[PDB]
UniProtKB/Swiss-Prot annotation:
Biological process annotations from GO: phosphate ion transport
Name of the protein this chain belongs to: Phosphate-binding protein PstS 2
Self-association and partners: The complex is composed of two ATP-binding proteins (PstB), two transmembrane proteins (PstC and PstA) and a solute-binding protein (PstS).
Membrane topology: Lipid-anchor
Stated role: Part of the ABC transporter complex PstSACB involved in phosphate import.
UniProt keywords, alphabetically: Cell membrane, Lipoprotein, Membrane, Palmitate, Phosphate transport, Signal, Stress response, Transport
Induction (UniProt): By phosphate starvation.
Entries under InterPro entries matching the protein: PBP_domain, Phosphate_ABC_transporter
Keyword DNA repair in record: no
Gene Ontology CC entries for this record: plasma membrane
Misc. remarks from the entry: Overexpression seems to confer resistance to penicillin.
Length: 257
């Protein structure tokens, strides 16, 4: 039958990542065109995508990998099954890093917060919040019961996870205030360079120009699962087919072997 493409709402960080990685979001200069199928219906959240795909035998959608449940089926992409292991070793291609960025301006307090994020406790916040931990080496954190304010600015996609990390840190450092500003990766990089943010949040690789004078560090890997209804006999798609389906070029399930 006819493929029912489920898209996330305009401005969604997951939509931005998905369309960029699959090449559906093309730049013909400094103007980006989102080629998402014009027939695609919209869901406003991960829960909404899950409900729509579980509720319709012909539907396909995309969600954060950590949100995958038995109520839907994740497709293999290029014959690779989405998992902690295939995201970590780079076999699974629908993934993006959650980077934090800082400069030589990073305060002692900012450095203590980075140490917490790098610690066994910090890594546990990441995995408990269902993201993948890229780091294999772990350090111990002991609170200095510091005081002061931190400004963390950038990607909306990293904001929720940053909030969880700030909560766990403030439990150990009650006199530390952490402000998290969600705007975008480019605004976060600029804020760090302009010294208006202590730490920036970037949900993609930095360009050579952006990286100048900065250090970046992946605090998490965010995989994206392409999900279908459990009734769907299809189990794998190529990256070409994936882009064809979500751009509305391939519209029937019989074309997917
Ligand atoms: Cl929309």
């Amino acid at each position: 039958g006819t493929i029912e493409v489920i898209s996330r709402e305009n401005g969604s960080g997951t939509r931005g990542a998905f369309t960029e990685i699959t090449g559906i979001l093309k730049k013909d200069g400094d103007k980006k065109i989102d080629n998402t199928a014009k027939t695609a219906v919209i869901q406003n959240s991960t829960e909404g995508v899950l409900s729509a795909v579980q509720g319709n035998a012909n539907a396909i959608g995309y969600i954060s990998l950590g949100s995958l449940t038995k109520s839907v089926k994740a497709l293999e992409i290029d014959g690779v099954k989405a998992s902690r292991d295939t995201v970590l070793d780079g076999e699974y291609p629908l993934q993006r890093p959650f980077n934090i960025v800082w400069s030589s301006n990073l305060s002692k307090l900012g450095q203590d917060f980075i140490s917490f994020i790098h610690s066994k406790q910090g890594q546990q916040v990441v995995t408990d919040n269902k993201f993948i931990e890229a780091k294999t080496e772990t350090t111990e954190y002991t609170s200095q019961h510091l005081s002061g304010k931190l400004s963390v600015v950038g990607s909306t996609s990293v904001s929720s996870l940053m909030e969880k990390l700030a909560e766990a840190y403030k439990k150990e450092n009650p006199e530390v205030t952490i402000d998290i500003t969600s705007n975008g990766s480019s605004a976060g990089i600029t804020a760090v360079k302009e010294k208006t943010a202590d730490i920036g949040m970037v949900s993609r690789e930095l360009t050579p120009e952006e990286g100048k004078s900065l250090t970046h560090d992946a605090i998490a890997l965010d995989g994206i699962a392409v999900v279908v209804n459990n009734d769907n006999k299809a189990s794998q798609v190529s990256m070409a087919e994936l882009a064809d389906v979500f751009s509305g070029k391939l519209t029937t399930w019989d074309k997917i072997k």
